[PDB]
Amino acid sequence: YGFQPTNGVGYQPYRVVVLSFELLHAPATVCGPKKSTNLVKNKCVNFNF
Amino acid sequence: AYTNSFTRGVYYPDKVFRSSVLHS
Numbered sequence: 001y002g003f004q005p006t007n008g009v010g011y012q013p014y015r016v017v018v019l020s021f022e023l024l025h026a027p028a029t030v031c032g033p034k035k036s037t038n039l040v041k042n043k044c045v046n047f048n049f
Numbered sequence: 050a051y052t053n054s055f056t057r058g059v060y061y062p063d064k065v066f067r068s069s070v071l072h073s
Binding site: 026027 | 064
């Protein structure tokens with residue numbers, strides 16, 4: 001590419017980042033931010049581990 | 050020399066517990 005500052009859009013350079021989330025078969029890893037919370041029991045509950 | 054394995058080289062395909070279950 002011979003990039004030059006006086007190029008019409010669609011010929012100017014764009015920087016690209018491709019994030020690819022993969023899930024092999026480990027025990028866990030990075031994730032969003034959760035506030036967690038105590039653990040109940042013996043009670044019908046709605047859980048996320 | 051060459052030799053014969055008999056029943057060798059079996060590994061747990063992954064995590065996940067499991068009990069009596071002829072799993073394929």
